[PDB]
Amino acid sequence: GAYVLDDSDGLGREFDGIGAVSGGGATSRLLVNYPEPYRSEILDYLFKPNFGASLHILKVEIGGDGQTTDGTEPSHMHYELDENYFRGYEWWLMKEAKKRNPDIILMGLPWSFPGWLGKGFSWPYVNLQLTAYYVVRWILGAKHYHDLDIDYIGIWNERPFDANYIKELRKMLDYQGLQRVRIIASDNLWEPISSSLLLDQELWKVVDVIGAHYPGTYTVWNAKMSGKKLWSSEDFSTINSNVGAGCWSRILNQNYINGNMTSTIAWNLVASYYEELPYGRSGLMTAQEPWSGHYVVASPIWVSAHTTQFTQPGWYYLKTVGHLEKGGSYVALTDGLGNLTIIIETMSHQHSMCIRPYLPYYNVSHQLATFTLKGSLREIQELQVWYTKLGRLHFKQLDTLWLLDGSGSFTLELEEDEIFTLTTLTTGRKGSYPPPPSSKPFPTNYKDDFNVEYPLFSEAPNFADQTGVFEYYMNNEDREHRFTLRQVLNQRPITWAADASSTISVIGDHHWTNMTVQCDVYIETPRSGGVFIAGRVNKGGILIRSATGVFFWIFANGSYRVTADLGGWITYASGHADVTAKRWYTLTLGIKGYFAFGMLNGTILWKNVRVKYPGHGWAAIGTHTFEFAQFDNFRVEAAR
Ligand SMILES: *[C@@H]1O[C@H](CO)[C@@H](O[C@@H]2O[C@H](CO)[C@@H](O)[C@H](O)[C@H]2NC(C)=O)[C@H](O)[C@H]1NC(C)=O
Ligand SMILES: *[C@@H]1O[C@H](CO)[C@@H](O[C@@H]2O[C@H](CO)[C@@H](O)[C@H](O)[C@H]2NC(C)=O)[C@H](O)[C@H]1NC(C)=O
Ligand SMILES: *[C@@H]1O[C@H](CO)[C@@H](O[C@@H]2O[C@H](CO)[C@@H](O)[C@H](O)[C@H]2NC(C)=O)[C@H](O)[C@H]1NC(C)=O
Ligand SMILES: *[C@@H]1O[C@H](CO)[C@@H](O)[C@H](O)[C@H]1NC(C)=O
Ligand SMILES: OC[C@H]1O[C@@H](O)[C@H](O)[C@@H](O)[C@H]1O
Ligand SMILES: [Ca+2]
Ligand 2 binding residues, C-beta < 6 A: 335, 337-339, 424
Locate the ligand 5 atom nearest the alpha carbon of residue 234 and give its number.
8
Interval between CA 619 and ligand 3 midpoint (Å): 19
512 and 620 inside one domain: yes
Interval between CA 619 and ligand 2 midpoint (Å): 55
Candidate from 513, 608, 611 with most ligand 3 atoms within 8 A of CB, to mutate: 513
167 and 238 inside one domain: no
8 Å CB contact between 631 and 510: no
- Ligand with the closest atom to the CA of 473: 6
Instruction: Count structural domains, the chain.
Output: 3
Omega into 255 within 30° of 0, i.e. cis?
A: no
Atom 18 in ligand 3: which residue has the minimum CA distance? 593
Domain residues for the domain of 323 are 1-56+233-440
* DSSP-derived 3-state class of residue 373: strand
Report the CATH number that the domain containing residue 349 is assigned in CATH.
3.20.20.80
Nearest to 187 by CA among 217, 152, 138, 141: 152
224 lines ligand 1 (CB under 6 A): yes
Among 232, 250, 283, the domain-final residue is 232
User: What letter represents residue 207's amino acid?
Assistant: V
- The C-alpha angle with vertex 604 and arms to 601 and 607, in degrees rounded to 5, equals 145
DSSP string, 218-256: ---HHHHHHT-EEEEEEEE-S-TTHHHHHHHHHHHHHHH
Whether 480 is a known active-site residue: answer: no
Interval between CA 257 and ligand 1 midpoint (Å): 9
CA distance 512 to 535: 9
Interval between CA 416 and ligand 6 midpoint (Å): 57
Q: How many helices (H) and strands (E) does the chain have?
A: 9, 36
504 and 600 inside one domain: yes
18 and 74 inside one domain: no
66 and 50 inside one domain: no
* Cα distances (Å, whole numbers) of residue 47 to 53, 335, 365: 7, 21, 35
The conformation of residue 33, written as its DSSP 8-state character, comes to T
User: What letter represents residue 552's amino acid?
Assistant: F
Atom 26 in ligand 1: which residue has the minimum CA distance? 224
8 Å CB contact between 62 and 493: no
Atom 3 in ligand 4: which residue has the minimum CA distance? 365
CA distance 342 to 360: 27
260 lines ligand 1 (CB under 6 A): yes
End-to-end CA distance of the chain: 58
User: CA torsion, points 110, 61, 145, 98, in degrees to nearest 10?
Assistant: -140
Residues belonging to the binding site are 69, 111, 157, 356
Q: CB neighbours of 127 closer than 8 A, spacing ≥ 6?
A: 117, 119
Report the CATH number that the domain containing residue 574 is assigned in CATH.
2.60.120.560
Is the torsion defined by CA of 78, 84, 85, 86 positive or negative? negative
Q: CB neighbours of 158 closer than 8 A, spacing ≥ 6?
A: 111, 187, 188, 213, 496
Q: CB neighbours of 58 closer than 8 A, spacing ≥ 6?
A: 19, 20, 22, 47, 93, 94, 97, 104, 105, 106, 107, 269
8 Å CB contact between 278 and 69: yes
- H or E element in which residue 413 lies: strand 409-414
The last residues before gaps in the chain (C-N over 2.5 Å) are: 391
Interval between CA 617 and ligand 6 midpoint (Å): 25
Partners of 609 in beta bridges: 596
Atom 16 in ligand 1: which residue has the minimum CA distance? 319
Report the CATH number that the domain containing residue 193 is assigned in CATH.
3.20.20.70
CA distance 159 to 577: 45
* DSSP-derived 3-state class of residue 505: strand
Nearest to 163 by CA among 130, 201, 136: 201
Among 391, 418, 440, the domain-final residue is 440
254 and 125 inside one domain: no
Locate the ligand 4 atom nearest the alpha carbon of residue 361 and give its number.
13
Is the torsion defined by CA of 447, 449, 450, 453 positive or negative? negative
262 and 379 inside one domain: yes
8 Å CB contact between 69 and 279: yes
213 and 245 inside one domain: no
478 and 573 inside one domain: yes
170 and 272 inside one domain: no
Among 422, 440, 458, the domain-final residue is 440
- The C-alpha angle with vertex 67 and arms to 62 and 73, in degrees rounded to 5, equals 40
Alpha helix ranges (H) inside 469-627:
none
Q: What is the CA radius of gyration of the chain?
A: 26
